[PDB]
Design a protein around this ligand. Structure first.
Ligand SMILES: C=CC1=C(C)/C(=C/c2[nH]c(/C=C3N=C(/C=C4\NC(=O)C(C)=C4C=C)C(C)=C\3CCC(=O)O)c(CCC(=O)O)c2C)NC1=O
Ligand SMILES: [Cl-]
Ligand SMILES: [Cl-]
Length: 243
């Protein structure tokens, strides 16, 4: 569950990943949660082929506004730590997609990504999100990274950095907390949309998932531990299921 107290991975993960996992779990803890059953009720898996072992822990929930909320922690061998999180919105409410991805090695966090990603056909966040996000101001980060082409799905507020130091790690985590606070609040003030609008939002979410599946960074890690067929099933059915 979300206490993370029973996590075998948590104690061994990069400190920024630990703080983000805690912040996400704390954001969700008091929501009207129900468990979301993943395919094969996956909650914990390990695999190895010729190289290092991959270990994954999944914690997945749903609420009336979020069809599926995944907080996944993973580790390859002793080096490589990963946090994956997506809140998949229920299209009826028209909320954007919260996501973040953190990858860390022995030399520190290599990649930190977070976004509230659009589902509207115009590729814009809803007005209230645009207002609340603009009010946060532009955060300063020394080592910005350019998104790959499939990353067109991310909003203009997307963060993609290599944190330079602890101050930046903490600034990034605080901005994710700010995104979550906005998202939670908007989830209370959102109404059921029209059938045509619900359809538009569903289409945006489907596109997001199809584009995320183009990420070979994820795919290679999965393939090196479990092989091609397993990785394809995991990406298309567990991580980024097309609704
Ligand atoms: C088993 C799960 C899982 C694995 C194995 C994983 C691996 C992974 N993701 C990466 C990058 C990345 N990850 C993302 C983004 C995301 N990825 C997401 O899963 C989500 C929800 C977003 C955004 C909200 C982007 C944009 C990159 C950079 C891709 C690139 O450089 O080509 C990288 C490269 C890190 C680096 O270049 O420093 C690895 C190894 N991420 C995972 O989540
Ligand atoms: Cl691409
Ligand atoms: Cl390699």
């Amino acid at each position: 569950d979300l206490s993370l107290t029973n996590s075998s991975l948590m104690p061994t993960l990069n400190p920024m990943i630990q703080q983000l996992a805690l912040a996400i779990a704390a954001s969700w803890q008091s929501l009207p949660l129900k468990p979301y059953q993943l395919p094969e009720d996956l909650g914990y898996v390990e695999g190895r082929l010729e190289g290092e072992k991959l270990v994954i822990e999944n914690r997945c929930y749903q609420t009336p506004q979020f069809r599926k909320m995944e907080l996944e922690l993973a580790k390859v061998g002793k080096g490589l730590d990963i946090l994956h999180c997506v809140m998949f919105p229920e299209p009826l409410y028209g909320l954007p997609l919260f996501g973040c991805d953190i990858v860390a090695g022995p030399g520190g966090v290599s990649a930190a990504i977070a976004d509230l990603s659009p589902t509207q056909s115009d590729r814009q966040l809803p007005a209230a999100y645009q207002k609340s996000l603009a009010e946060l101001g532009q955060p300063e980060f020394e080592q910005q990274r350019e998104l790959p082409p499939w990353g067109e799905i991310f909003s203009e507020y997307c963060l993609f950095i290599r944190p330079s130091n602890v101050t930046e790690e903490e600034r990034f985590v605080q901005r994710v907390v700010d995104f979550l606070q906005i998202h939670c609040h908007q989830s209370i003030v959102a109404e059921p949309l029209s059938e045509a609008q619900t359809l538009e939002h569903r289409q945006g979410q489907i596109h997001y998932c199809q584009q995320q599946q183009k990420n070979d960074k994820t795919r290679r890690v999965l393939e090196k531990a479990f092989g091609e067929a397993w990785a394809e099933r995991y990406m298309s059915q567990v991580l980024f299921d097309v609704i």
